[PDB]
């Protein structure tokens, strides 16, 4: 089964900062990979559809890249509404796998 | 308005086509100065915006199943066209009915004076 | 908008069995399959199970670390789902969710509020 | 036969009893019959399973259909299989047939077996795709990439030069069928399962270098599991 | 344990042609990499090589005789054959079929035919 | 609006077709599990209601005669279609003329207010 | 080319200068090109008259046309005729040609004669019907049922397993042509006229039973009129 | 609306066709009694009225050039038709748009009362 | 692909973004795909230039297209050319191919040369016209008249029995290629340029009459310039 990791385990940030997240995995020919985030007291919410297509109602700031074992999440700038933790997953078929996540620490 | 089968959809679409509008040089119109027989191909990439690529695969499977029977019913050997016939029925479904405004057809624009 | 709600949660004694459940509306069951996932501060999110659409003859899957400790069920006239835990052993204290989504995306695009289920 | 319709940026099924003009076919160039690669559904590519997917029927005649240009395939196949009595099996391709344009790894097979029936046929009915013509039957030689077809209404040398993996077949079309990889005029490795084209490609680390290389009057088969290579494990 | 059986053409005129054959009644010959072949011993002479045949569809010949020698097989009957153009007195010999015996490493052949002979007149 | 030739019409119509909507099992979509090559045929019976069967024979003879010349004029070898072309002219006879109401065409429904 | 039109529950001729919408072609599946059996017009089925209806022309090339499924034929024919010098006469059928689906009594003929011309052709221009393709020319072997074709606008094993009557031909395509019935490797009976397939079928009351049955080193011909059977009237 | 290339146009048009309406005798419908295979041809003459013949040659050259690429894009071997497809697009360019009067289409006759 | 349109008694180009109903296609019988003779553009008819216009390519497959009946050609060609090793060069014509209906002077050529490539092809891409089918490739034997094709929207034995000029080729498809006229089993006259079919036809004033006529065991070539005839100037 495909294994996956994420880094940095957390990132300290400032408002309007450009950020990115590394996610790595056993190789995946599928671009099925996707990203989501959650807040304390909140159910997870999808950020991007598989590969790079953004989830509906997601701000233009969001972006991402890659295929196979290496891919990433990017955000052009940050808003305080984006505080939370972030994840990525393998939806290539089954069993599903998920990253340990990251934390959006504040400066 | 369909959803994916248990199979796993690869959202990527990497494809090739024979289309090539225009010609690089006037001699390229000529097969004698034309590209090698494999040179006709061109390629491009699409992504699963709005679920379209994956939706396409499911649609394709259903279409393939429907098509299999039709082909059994054909008598012609290489079935070079179908879409032309489909275009004809696209029109037939829209035409030969009575149609001023009252019928639910012909997309008549609202009436001005 | 999915109208999903969750039920059957809370503390239970170890060695038991329970049918954790969900209900939803505004997204017909005829167009999808569903997943259960779980989360803990010690684990992060993890997949638990997959429930296929009847076109797949309701085939199911479970994470191998939990497989055979749970079964699933669904009712497409009631729009309801069951985790049908076979056991209530230990370490099952993570928050439970049930998800669904567009087949041309993935099931992550809908989730419950989640529920707490715990073991003594 | 239903047609895909793109409207409101989503697919819709054409089979409705009202054709609302919101979808318009301004020209025939909005029509497409594009082929799709079966492989894009996650279908296994092990050669033994490919064999499992072919019916070996005799009876009803073959048919083909014209289709629109479509996606690249990572895996495709060429076939030389013949009947055990040395009879040719499967018809030569018809005029205008040529191999699929973009296969990354055409797999070539040769050898013999019962090769039951006369027209093969896909057990799932999946199309064989030769160039721009889908087929219900396998043709000799040239590459066919398994796929399906769909019809929708619209609103560098490595791209074909790549190709590796040629191997022998032992038996054909039956459960008993077996395959052996061939390099350097050496028949070897059972290729049982789980081998990506790259998994097999890296095995050429032994060619003229780290192993095998039967510098004898004949070639030796190694039975795959150096443990994998199974050097000197030939019998 | 294979009952390999010799077979072949009868007496022929020199300048003639010859067909030779054998069969593996004890074995299907369906194992991949099986090698079978021919050799001859004129006048009590040593094992002159004639030809090799592989189950994997590979053929080899003794180049000195190759211009007049051809390999054929019929697997459905476990048969192997030779065709010889221009048979003459220099071609009179005992003849034998052969098969790999250890099987799959260093040829190891090895297993032998009953023996037959050919003469001309 | 035609009548029968001196030949003798048999009013019975016993016929066969290749049409078969749907499939008995999902595997029947697949030629591999498909019916024997003659199994595609289905059959039925019709009777000369309103003189239709006999009328059909006469019509067929006339059509055959007209067709013979057309085929002589064709250049294509197996003439796999014609009806598609006829459908096109069905439409062309009804379209590209001016047409509000005054022209004798387009079946415009009476106008309401 | 006129099309039948069904309207007001009657046939109407499409060739008018006004196409009133009372007839509507909602889809292409209302169209039909159905074949019709010539036999349904009461046309004689005696084999000698069938021969009289074929032209034996050389010259203009053959053509075929696709047509819709159609009525059963009681009588149909298979042909092996060759030129007197042993030349083959008439082309082998083209790919996709097969015999008509429902003939009750396919008649088979073999033998030789001048077999003038190269493409035969029907003297009335009637179509030969092979499976789903009408033809202007006779193909070797496989069954052709004489018929015509019409185009109209719409608003168990015995069904093909039946078949009797195989016979020899003496001469071909000419007034002098003659036929002899064959059973049990015996050539007999001139088949002159007036014989239904059942009339001939009942003649098998003699086979291995009531007559004929030349238990000799050769076969004897009987000249039809026991008076009919013409037993021992062979010369 | 085109003009001639430096080539030299011969204004004469002498041509032949396979068309022959009707039949001289009823047997002429029948290929058996039909004309010799070359007898199908008929012929006629046209003159460059209004520059039409010469215009035709230039148009033909341009069409030939456009056609060459299209044929390269075809997958079918003998391309027996094209005009039928063109007829379909003739209709498609005129239909499926909204169309009462306001749109620049359907040639609606002026409205009377 | 643009279509000619006849309106206001003039040609108009169909490729506009508005299709005004002033042009109407009441039926499909207004459509035409007529062929045009390349010769009608004043293109040279010297046989050496005809050779200059052919590409001799190998590679991409041949294609043909159906077209409407069209204008007479004064000059057309038949070809028997073969490779120097006696290999056949250029494919036999496909079924249904026959020579153009009205050529006044079919020119026939035979002989050998390198005959490079396998499919010929016209260097300008001009169509070869066989009967009613345009081609991108030259077929063996039968006449092809160089031409183009256009599509427009519409609002006695000598006609084919004429034909003269058969000659040998020396080399083929290359600058070095040369031709010699042949009459009475005599190879003669280089045919370099400037010779109308009538210019050549009048040279038969010598046949069995005023000159040449090698009444010997072999035939003599005369080198064209009696000065023209080059009698006795053979070497
Ligand atoms: C459109 O897309 C759908 C998928 O969305 C395709 O559906 C597939 O259909 C095939 C059959 O048509 C299914 O294959 C079936 O799988 C069964 C299970 O195999 C598994 O289980 C075994 C045993 O444990 C494992 O070893 C193996 O790894 C698998 O996990 C088989 O039991 C079935 O076989 C029986 O029936 C077939 C068909 O007659 C016989 O050939 C067999 O011999 C046997 O009798 C069968 O193979 C497949 O699972 C479906 N997948 C999905 C996702 O639905 C459609 O095929 C496709 N449409 C077209 C026209 O191609
Ligand atoms: C559509 O349907 C009509 C019927 O409705 C068919 O019409 C038939 O047409 C054929 C000719 O095309 C007719 O056949 C002719 O019959 C004449 C009389 O034969 C009879 O008389 C003799 C002598 O007494 C009797 O022995 C015999 O039993 C018959 O009673 C013949 O004299 C004609 O022959 C002459 O012309 C033909 C044609 O060139 C030559 O071949 C002959 O050698 C000879 O020169 C001829 O055979 C038939 O009678 C018509 N029947 C009807 C009912 O009209 C059409 O054929 C059909 N359309 C198509 C296209 O198939
Ligand atoms: C539609 O109609 C137009 C005309 O209206 C045609 O156009 C012709 O196009 C060809 C090329 O496609 C032209 O031919 C060119 O002529 C050049 C000059 O040749 C002359 O000059 C030499 C040297 O002085 C004289 O000996 C000779 O007698 C001529 O006077 C050549 O130099 C060109 O050759 C170079 O390019 C060609 C093409 O690659 C090579 O084959 C040659 O080897 C060389 O490299 C060339 O031959 C012609 O002049 C054009 N005529 C006109 C009137 O425009 C189109 O061809 C036609 N459309 C189609 C598709 O057929
Ligand atoms: C395992 O390793 C061996 C090396 O140990 C490797 O053999 C190599 O194969 C390549 C390709 O056959 C050889 O390079 C070729 O040399 C010839 C002659 O100069 C060229 O004509 C070839 O070019 C053609 O093929 C190319 C690749 O498709 C095309 O790009 C090109 O356009 C031509 O069509 C090619 O350059 C090389 O010399 C050998 N080397 C040795 C030492 O064997 C073998 O391929 C490996 N096994 C596998 C299965 O990959
Ligand atoms: C005149 O009478 C004789 C009998 O005196 C009669 O001969 C009979 O012919 C039938 C059919 O050939 C024979 O029965 C056959 O037996 C074989 C062998 O077992 C079967 O394979 C045959 O079955 C095939 O054909 C059937 C009929 O088409 C199919 O229904 C079936 O699916 C098979 O394809 C068949 O049963 C019978 O044994 C002989 N009997 C004798 C004594 O000759 C002859 O047919 C009569 N003449 C004519 C022209 O009818
Ligand atoms: C140069 O002059 C010589 C005469 O000095 C000339 O030879 C003549 O050729 C014609 C045609 O071949 C000969 O007439 C022919 O005779 C035969 C036999 O009777 C006929 O079958 C021929 O008729 C066929 O061909 C005709 C023309 O195509 C058709 O109209 C007809 O339907 C037939 O198909 C034809 O009449 C004549 O006898 C000779 N005369 C001599 C003395 O040679 C030669 O043709 C001239 N050279 C060239 C190239 O024109
Ligand atoms: C290949 O398959 C056949 C049949 O699938 C095997 O023979 C069958 O073996 C089973 C037991 O596994 C028996 O119950 C059947 O009676 C046998 N006959 C059949 C069903 O064909 C055979 O053993 C297999 N051998 C290999 C190595 O492929
Ligand atoms: C077969 O037919 C030919 C011609 O139809 C017969 O020969 C003709 O016989 C008639 C008298 O009936 C003569 O007037 C003709 O001069 C003969 N020649 C012709 C017209 O070909 C011949 O007798 C017939 N024979 C048989 C038994 O069929
Ligand atoms: C035929 O053509 C070739 C090439 O067109 C001639 O050889 C060339 O001659 C030119 C001088 O005219 C040299 O500059 C080239 O180097 C030669 N090689 C080439 C370009 O192929 C040859 O002389 C010609 N001969 C005849 C009689 O046709
Ligand atoms: C492989 O064997 C064949 C004979 O089967 C021989 O022709 C060829 O030279 C061999 N390959 C190499 C690269 O030596
Ligand atoms: C009829 O004769 C043929 C030889 O012409 C022979 O092969 C066959 O056995 C005979 N038929 C029967 C049923 O004896
Ligand atoms: C011309 O020569 C051929 C042999 O090449 C010969 O058959 C023929 O009779 C000769 N032509 C004439 C008219 O003598």
Coordinates of N, CA and C and ligand atoms in Angstrom, one line a residue, chain I residues 161 164-165 181 183 201 204-205 207-209, ligand 6:
Chain I
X161 N -12.4 6.5 -78.3 CA -11.6 5.6 -79.2 C -10.3 6.3 -79.7
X164 N -3.3 8.0 -79.4 CA -2.1 7.7 -80.1 C -0.9 8.0 -79.1
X165 N 0.3 7.6 -79.6 CA 1.6 7.8 -78.9 C 1.9 6.9 -77.8
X181 N 10.3 7.3 -78.9 CA 9.0 7.0 -79.6 C 9.0 5.6 -80.2
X183 N 7.2 2.9 -83.0 CA 6.3 2.5 -84.0 C 6.8 1.3 -84.7
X201 N 2.1 12.7 -84.5 CA 1.2 11.9 -85.3 C 1.6 12.0 -86.8
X204 N 4.1 9.7 -88.6 CA 3.7 8.5 -89.2 C 3.6 8.5 -90.7
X205 N 4.0 9.7 -91.2 CA 4.1 9.9 -92.7 C 5.3 9.0 -93.2
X207 N 5.8 6.0 -91.9 CA 5.7 4.6 -91.6 C 5.2 3.8 -92.7
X208 N 6.0 2.9 -93.1 CA 5.9 2.0 -94.3 C 5.9 2.9 -95.6
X209 N 6.3 4.2 -95.5 CA 6.3 5.1 -96.6 C 7.5 5.9 -96.9
Ligands
LIG6 C1 0.8 4.9 -89.8 O1 0.2 4.4 -91.0 C2 -0.2 3.1 -91.1 C3 -0.6 2.8 -92.5 O2 0.5 3.0 -93.4 C4 -1.3 2.8 -90.1 O3 -1.5 1.4 -90.1 C5 -3.0 1.2 -90.1 O4 -3.5 1.0 -88.8 C6 -5.0 0.8 -88.9 C7 -5.5 0.6 -87.4 O5 -4.7 -0.4 -86.8 C8 -5.3 -0.4 -89.7 O6 -6.7 -0.5 -89.8 C9 -7.2 -1.5 -88.8 O7 -7.4 -2.8 -89.4 C10 -7.9 -3.8 -88.5 C11 -8.1 -5.1 -89.2 O8 -9.1 -5.0 -90.2 C12 -9.1 -3.3 -87.8 O9 -9.5 -4.3 -86.8 C13 -8.9 -2.0 -87.1 O10 -10.1 -1.6 -86.5 C14 -10.0 -1.4 -85.1 O11 -9.3 -0.2 -84.7 C15 -10.0 0.9 -85.2 C16 -9.2 2.2 -84.9 O12 -9.0 2.3 -83.5 C17 -11.4 1.0 -84.6 O13 -12.1 2.1 -85.2 C18 -12.2 -0.3 -84.8 O14 -13.4 -0.2 -84.1 C19 -11.4 -1.5 -84.4 O15 -11.2 -1.5 -83.0 C20 -8.4 -1.0 -88.0 O16 -9.4 -0.7 -89.0 C21 -4.8 -0.3 -91.1 O17 -5.0 -1.5 -91.9 C22 -3.3 0.0 -91.0 N1 -2.7 0.2 -92.4 C23 -1.4 0.0 -92.6 C24 -1.1 -0.1 -94.1 O18 -0.6 -0.1 -91.8 C25 -0.8 3.2 -88.7 O19 -1.9 3.2 -87.8 C26 -0.2 4.6 -88.7 N2 0.4 4.9 -87.4 C27 -0.2 5.5 -86.4 C28 0.6 5.5 -85.1 O20 -1.3 6.0 -86.5

